[PDB]
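Summary for the lay section of the report: proteins are chains of building blocks that fold into shapes. Here we show the chain for Tumor necrosis factor receptor superfamily member 14 and then a coded description of the shape we predicted for it.
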Amino acid sequence: MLPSCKEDEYPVGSECCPKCSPGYRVKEACGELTGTVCEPCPPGTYIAHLNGLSKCLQCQMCDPAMGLRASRNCSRTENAVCGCSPGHFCIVQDGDHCAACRAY
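The coded shape description reads as follows.
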């Protein structure tokens, strides 16, 4: 009942178009003759939700110089999770994750 698109849709001026699935970003907006054209997030990026954006979100880096290993790798639909490399322990915890590890 509102001047607003459904949750599974996004606005392109006065139109509502269908969203890309997780893992995908908008290459071309929907029109009369075309559906929303979506491409796979570029390597390094993810989106976890339906979206109507043309860029993907930046994937977490787990820098081995900080004593980090990718605990979950980064996929097109999920962010990387970092843990300590084996034989390293956590030296700084930022909320629910470790930002650096030391050898021991």
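Put simply, here is one thing we learned. The chain has no helices and ten strands.
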